[PDB]
Structure to design on (832 residues):
């Protein structure tokens, strides 16, 4: 369902054909200067394979930020065109509009084998389907108009390449609209599906999910679905104290208690025993007398519990130790979830040590996947990106996929 | 299972007399130059405020959001003009405060008429409400987790009793929805009514329970369709979707009509589950087709067997399919409706959805419980002004969808029992 999709590295003879590539260019910009060039850098291998493979034109469509169907100086793709010139060694044509009888007239009769970037897709209301007007009121797009926009994209090119995995969860016009015969994943999309398929379709057992973060309540379905696929789970960092008070009536102090989530842990634990999943909650905690880096700290176990005005912010050394046997015996791991407040040096040991083990287990041969933001922020703070099998770029779609969702942008691809 | 409804409400709440009550309201309302162009959402909270008022209550502190300011004070989304509207509706003074937490707010709340209504400014001006935001430049910014902690405990300081009358942001776990850690957490009159009808229809419904789904895409409604098939007895799939179903299942010559490439790959899986679960599926059998996606185009009628000629498109259900709604709808004892049966925004292609609506009106009077999932289906009921002829027109976008998709709704879970 997820790993049998047509990819760019199979498109026999794309020579002399017009290619539309949906890319992810949602980059940090600050006074017209791109603060982080990492996306777009990631786009080159697909742009380049199209170059060396023939290809009359290479049309690039993407979005930046959330402009909500209105034009907006703040979210232009123009500085992205500037950067691409330095990275390709050629002039890049940047057009101020996405669709029209005039833009397909500037693509045609523009240097052969060249790349063209079109202006932000979300400047049109018909990309998403909904907008907000000049005053800040939700506007909905005419159905006639969305249909027209999708027809206009479809006639910009001959072949559609989708290299924007971070939007595949949205059923937007660029995801489900380009109705050409050949619809293939770019290299980025390819690598996303390849690994997610490797861990979700037919993984090699045991299969571990490391979950973490503050709330239990937004990660309900994320847990529910996983308990079907997963062999073992580590629940940690914040959401653990909710599990602890509800299951072991542990004294929690002023630790983050998720009242919405507290209602459902019983349900989760029932499904867990039912699906035969090992659970591994923390067994001990580093606690502090105030939620900041520079506060007094000590250690308590699950049975001693937490003093009445103190709070747990990281797993204790024994829980850390306890995930030596859990991670190292696993032949595939899905992470996504810090094991405490890693942004805070003192209360970071847990997440850092967890990473060291995942790096190690990858070295031992296992397949490892890092999920959303935060966890990736850690992987990138530590500069360990490629000691892990895969770190998913964009947590919109990666969460949804791990959640059990279908992903419209993946289904729109050929086979 | 079980969690929806059987929750607490203002109704059946003793000991409200002399208490500071924090009410989470839905004031996300259309505005131009400080002039609220539709006050429905505001008048809707009047029962809640009134009952609280009429019960004692030292203070009635209102917290809400307007639009998507993304964690920054932004003038186009200030709640000030609402306070001006509430003054007109309650016939008294209403205190509007620029902040929503902190030292000063708590003091200025305390020194105010001992039965007063106070409106605090847009929650979403604080990054900690949603949890994420965007900075002045346009780049995504994530909130510090200890700042959320302070924000959530600050809102809890504001009052003694919490009342949540903002179904519609129940599907999101924002600070104002799961952060007010007070002993008494109860639903408002609007919330109570949402929770009441959905459980009435999704837990122990009068059978036969009918779902009516419609719209352009089928690729985004997969989770909706799937979760509904294990609780429903009848289902009508209409307008836009229908074609994607008709080409996959009946090999229909479909014309230029809307085809969902993403969705066609799932039609199979759906019909298998529908048969497994013994759910009758109803699909249009004739169509109104045009030679152009435009009102006042050329129109004629064709059966699915005749098929749509090339370069023509189906834009509405045909007369026999419309006629065929009678027996499906009028024999149902409970109806869930989330999707128009055609391009109803064009008079020429609205006969389907309108005639559907009249039949849903007709079965309500026959004693059935009818619910409009709405958004797009809602605006039709509005346009026809028949919002009263239906048991419940859900006043919630994504929260009603995620509930009908079988998800959990943090806002709800966080209420007392």
């Amino acid at each position: 369902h997820l790993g049998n999709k047509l990819s760019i590295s199979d498109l026999k003879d794309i020579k002399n054909k017009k290619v539309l590539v949906r890319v992810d260019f949602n980059v940090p910009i600050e006074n017209g200067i791109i603060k982080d060039t990492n996306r777009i850098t990631a786009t080159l291998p697909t742009i380049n394979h199209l170059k060396k493979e023939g290809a009359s034109k290479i049309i690039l469509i993407s979005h930046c930020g959330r402009p909500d169907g209105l034009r907006n100086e703040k979210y232009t793709l123009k500085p992205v065109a500037e950067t691409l010139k330095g990275l390709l060694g050629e002039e890049v044509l940047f057009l101020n509009d996405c669709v029209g009888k005039e833009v397909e007239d500037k693509i045609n009769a523009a240097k052969e084998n060249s790349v063209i970037l079109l202006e932000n897709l979300r400047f049109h209301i018909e990309e998403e389907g909904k907008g907000v007007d000049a005053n800040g009121n939700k506007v909905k797009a005419n159905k006639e108009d969305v249909e027209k926009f999708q027809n206009d994209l479809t006639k910009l090119a001959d072949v559609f390449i989708n290299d924007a995995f971070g939007t595949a969860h949205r059923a937007h016009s660029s995801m489900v609209g380009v109705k050409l015969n050949v619809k293939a994943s770019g290299f980025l999309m390819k690598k996303e599906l390849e690994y997610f398929s490797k861990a979700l379709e037919n993984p090699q057992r045991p299969l571990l999910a490391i979950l973490g973060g503050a709330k239990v309540s937004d990660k309900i379905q994320l847990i529910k679905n996983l308990l079907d696929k997963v062999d073992r789970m580590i629940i940690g960092g914040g959401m653990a104290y909710t599990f602890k008070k509800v299951l072991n009536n542990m004294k929690i102090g002023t630790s983050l208690f998720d009242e919405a989530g507290s209602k459902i842990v019983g349900e989760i634990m029932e499904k867990a025993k039912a699906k035969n999943v090992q659970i591994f909650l923390p067994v001990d905690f580093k606690i502090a007398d105030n939620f900041d880096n520079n506060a007094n700290t000590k250690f308590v176990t699950d049975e001693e519990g937490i003093p009445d005005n103190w709070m747990g912010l990281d797993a204790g050394p024994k829980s850390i130790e306890n995930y030596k046997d859990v991670i190292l015996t696993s032949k595939t791991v899905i992470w996504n979830g810090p094991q405490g407040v890693f942004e805070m040096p003192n209360f970071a040991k847990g997440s850092i040590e967890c990473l060291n083990l995942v790096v190690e287990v990858t070295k031992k041969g296992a397949i490892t996947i890092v999920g959303g933001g935060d966890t990736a922020s850690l992987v990138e703070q530590q500069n360990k990106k490629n000691e892990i099998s895969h770190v998913s770029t964009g947590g919109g779609a990666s969460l949804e996929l791990l959640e059990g969702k279908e992903l419209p942008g993946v289904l729109a691809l050929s086979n």
Summary: The two ends of chain B are 15 Å apart (CA to CA).
